[PDB]
Design a protein around this ligand. Structure first.
Ligand SMILES: C=C1/C(=C\C=C(/C)c2cccc(CCC#CCC(O)(C(F)(F)F)C(F)(F)F)c2)C[C@@H](O)C[C@@H]1O
Ligand SMILES: C=C1/C(=C\C=C(/C)c2cccc(CCC#CCC(O)(C(F)(F)F)C(F)(F)F)c2)C[C@@H](O)C[C@@H]1O
Lengths: 238, 10, 238, 10
């Protein structure tokens, strides 16, 4: 049995994800096109930049995220945006292809496409293995969105002020996820622990990605290809 | 410093 | 008779323009595409941003521009870039269409296309009349490039330090233009004065455009569509 | 402040 306040939280996290994730990927025709010197940085910088707006949209509909001081909202988003991106991209990841497939061969991104955007196998080796292990978990829609919301509501991020308040938020989501799995996911006895482990790998992926973003953003010939929101969110301003 | 993020946060 | 040092200056200004202006406009397929709410700001912001790199490329080959202190180079470029843009776009302007035609109906920009990028007829009314009057002058290639180089080498810009030095540069280009017209342009007796007038209208167009850029860049929903080089060059940092 | 412009100016 989930409480009534528990399935409300699930109902509004699923709806929030549905409003901010467009399985047609038809907006992708508006990015600077893919070129396959780093030939994919314009298209991928545009793809991330767009995804960041979807994550901001999603975050504003998590129960009580809007209630946080506007400094906490920014602090949560600057540190967690890239992890939510990696999490949410699982929805287009394909085990058959070992690539993110977003409708059409021109929006099918192999590992190689991402190296032609600045990144190395030091980030792309763990990132793909994270993607397949998360794909293997075979999460329900309700679990996927719960995990993204738990990721965003982490108190242990640099620059958060109300440690007390948002730890309580994240506590309320973890209990929903534990109850949902046990009650609604048959054979889920170890699923909660595997999910928690996925959060930990995200911190390791974040760290590597931030390293590699730094080196991009320190070379103006590359950083001029980024967008203004990428530079403001992945940037190091306090 | 987060001119866009504030806008986006409504 | 032009001196030998005079036709050298013409030879290297023409070559500089040819290396930085691609009449195939084939690079245009890499901008965020045109959409015809302001639907043309992504494509046009990309077009200007690319053009700014061409003008930086052109400037670095003007005789002795490279010899200036790197602060003067930046000062000259931040104030004059938009005028050189308006000047150089004359090459794709078409009196038949009243639009800039860059190869294909998808890169054919009417006045309307530019209003769907933030700008008003207060800038687009004088800008088009400047374009046709400059088109009517029927400038030789050597005159076009001389005028762009004279525009860039203006001492009377905010933030220039070596007023003496670059006034002498611009003096040396004006004398080339006067001699070129008289000697090589039949019936050019009034052409130099009309060209000088075109510089004056550029200051009026610059002023209006900077006004309208300010209002764009003060609204984050629009300014996030700009590129990093647009924001750094049209921006007001000293 | 003109991080890109300096790069571009070689
Ligand atoms: C993002 C999503 C999707 C796919 C994700 C992909 C392909 C992806 C592949 C490798 C790595 C990442 C992480 C973000 C990065 C970066 C780039 C960069 O570091 C730089 F460009 F500089 F190289 C920067 F952009 F972040 F700056 C995403 C598709 C769909 O599932 C929606 C979802 O949202
Ligand atoms: C530029 C060229 C060409 C055409 C010029 C056009 C169509 C043009 C039309 C109207 C006005 C301007 C001036 C620049 C602006 C702005 C936009 C903006 O103000 C904003 F986007 F914000 F709206 C910003 F981008 F500058 F920021 C250019 C084609 C070819 O001849 C190469 C040449 O170089």
């Amino acid at each position: 049995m989930l409480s009534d306040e528990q399935m409300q939280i699930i109902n509004s996290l699923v709806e929030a994800h549905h409003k901010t994730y467009d399985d047609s990927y038809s907006d992708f025709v508006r990015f600077r096109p893919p070129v396959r010197r780093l030939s994919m940085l314009p298209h991928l910088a545009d793809l991330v930049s767009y995804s960041i707006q979807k994550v901001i949209g999603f975050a504003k509909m998590i129960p009580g995220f809007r209630d946080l001081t506007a400094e906490d909202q920014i602090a949560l988003l600057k540190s967690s945006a890239i992890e939510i991106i990696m999490l949410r991209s699982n929805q287009s990841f394909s085990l058959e292809d070992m690539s993110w497939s977003c409708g059409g061969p021109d929006f099918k991104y192999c590992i190689n496409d991402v190296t032609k955007a600045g990144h190395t196998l030091e980030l792309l080796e763990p990132l793909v293995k994270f993607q397949v292990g998360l794909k293997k978990l075979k999460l329900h829609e309700e679990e996927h969105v719960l995990l993204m919301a738990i990721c965003l509501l982490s108190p242990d991020r640099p620059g958060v002020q109300d440690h007390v308040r948002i730890e309580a938020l994240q506590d309320r989501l973890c209990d929903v996820l534990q109850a949902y799995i046990r009650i609604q996911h048959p054979g889920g006895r170890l699923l909660y622990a595997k999910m928690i482990q996925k959060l930990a790998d995200l911190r390791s992926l974040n760290e590597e990605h931030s390293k590699q973003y730094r080196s991009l953003s320190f070379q103006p010939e590359h950083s001029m290809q980024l967008t203004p929101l990428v530079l403001e969110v992945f940037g190091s301003e306090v | 410093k987060h001119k866009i993020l504030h806008r986006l946060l409504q």
